[PDB]
């Protein structure tokens, strides 16, 4: 279940990172002016650089902690919070965690993993929500 997919991403949680972030750029190539280090790199590049390593785990250490903190997919009030507040998503709306969600979601479908794909898909409608009442446009 959601519990059980925490702990296997954590496992190895640099290339889950990397795959799942590579991923929402495939999907949604537009998405990646947001990270004008990243234009123009292949994904060996970007396994390359460590700043991309360290953006990737950093994001998705954050997102498991606050997925761990949920109680049946609802996140708190206060990590939602977090999210918006965060200087390096100021310009950022709903649509663009919708995104990544769609994703996130699509690249657990499709790993032939045990993912419980169903709860990822509710957390994050929920965190949506949470991040719009935050403040998010
Ligand atoms: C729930 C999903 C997300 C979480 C948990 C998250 C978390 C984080 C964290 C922890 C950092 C800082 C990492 C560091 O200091 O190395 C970060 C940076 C950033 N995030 Fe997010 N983020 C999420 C979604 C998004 C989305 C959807 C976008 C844009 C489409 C985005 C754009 C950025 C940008 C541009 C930075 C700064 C990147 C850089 O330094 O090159 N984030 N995020």
Redesign the pocket.
């Given at each position: 279940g959601f519990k059980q997919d925490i702990a296997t991403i954590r496992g190895d949680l640099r290339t889950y990172a990397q795959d799942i972030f590579l991923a929402?750029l495939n999907k949604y190539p537009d998405?990646r002016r947001?990270?004008?280090?990243?234009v123009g790199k292949s994904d060996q590049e970007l396994k390359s650089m460590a700043?991309f390593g360290?953006?990737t785990?950093?994001?998705?250490?954050?997102?498991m902690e606050?997925a761990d903190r949920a109680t049946d997919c609802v996140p708190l009030a206060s990590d939602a919070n977090t999210?918006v507040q965060?200087k390096?998503?100021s310009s950022?709306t709903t649509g663009?965690?919708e995104?990544?969600?769609v994703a996130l979601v699509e690249y657990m479908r499709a790993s032939g993993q045990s993912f419980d794909s169903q709860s990822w898909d509710r957390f994050?409608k929920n965190?949506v929500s949470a991040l719009s009442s935050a403040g998010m446009k």
């Open positions: 929402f998405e947001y990270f004008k280090n990243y700043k360290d953006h785990e950093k994001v998705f250490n954050l997102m606050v999210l965060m390096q998503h950022l663009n965690f995104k990544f969600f994050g965190l």
